[PDB]
Amino acid sequence: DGFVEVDMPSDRPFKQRRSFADRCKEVQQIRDQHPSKIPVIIERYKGEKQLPVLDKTKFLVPDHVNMSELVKIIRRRLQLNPTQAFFLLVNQHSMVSVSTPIADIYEQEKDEDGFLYMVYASQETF
């Protein structure tokens, strides 16, 4: 009766994989090396199945760009058709115009650890 050791890649959100201390320390280091860049965590929405999971979830973007540039980055990384539509929600369930500067979104919506959390989902998911 040996243990059937099962092991598989964790699908848990970034907040559950990295501790609060590690996340705070990481933003602190990043903002000290790159004071004009925003640390953004972009993950797949919890109820999304139509869109795949991206290999990368941590993004370091210039603080002079708008939400639009962030959509362009994710869209290309997802390799979407023009027929494929998706939303980019700040924190959770929160939607802003793509013309909105990310620096404005950051200072208003950033988590306590310093990261700005976003999720992507299909428009049909909601």
Residue numbers in the entry: -6 to 119
Q: Which passages does the manuscript contain on this structure?
A:
The nonstructural small (NSs) protein is the primary virulence factor of RVFV that suppresses the host’s antiviral innate immune response. Interestingly, these searches identified four putative LIR motifs that are located between residues 4–7 (4FPVI7), 59–62 (59FYNV62), 238–241 (238WIPV241) and 261–264 (261FVEV264) in the NSs sequence. In humans, the six LC3-family proteins (LC3A, LC3B, LC3C, GABARAP, GABARAPL1 and GABARAPL2) are key autophagy factors that function by regulating growth of autophagic membranes, recognition of autophagic cargoes, and fusion of autophagic membranes with lysosomes.
However, crystals were obtained by fusing NSs4 to the N-terminus of either GABARAP or LC3A, a method commonly used to examine the structures of LIR motifs with LC3-family protein. In complex with NSs4, both LC3A and GABARAP adopt the canonical Atg8 fold, similar to what has been observed in previously reported structures of their free forms as well as in other structures of fusion proteins with LIR motifs. Likewise, NSs4 bound in a linear conformation to both LC3A and GABARARP in a similar manner to what has been observed for a typical LIR motif in complex with an LC3 protein. These residues insert into HP1 and HP2 on the surfaces of LC3A and GABARAP respectively, which is consistent with most other previously determined structures of LIR motifs in complex with LC3-family proteins. In addition to the interactions involving F261, the side chain of V264 of NSs4 forms hydrophobic contacts with the side chain of F52 (5.3Å), V54 (4.3Å), P55 (4.1Å), V58 (6.8Å), L63 (6.8Å) and I66 (3.9Å) in HP2 of LC3A whereas, the corresponding hydrophobic interactions in HP2 of GABARAP occur between the side chain of V264 of NSs4 and the side chains of Y49 (4Å), V51 (4.1Å), P52 (4Å), L55 (3.7Å), F60 (4.5Å) and L63 (3.4Å).
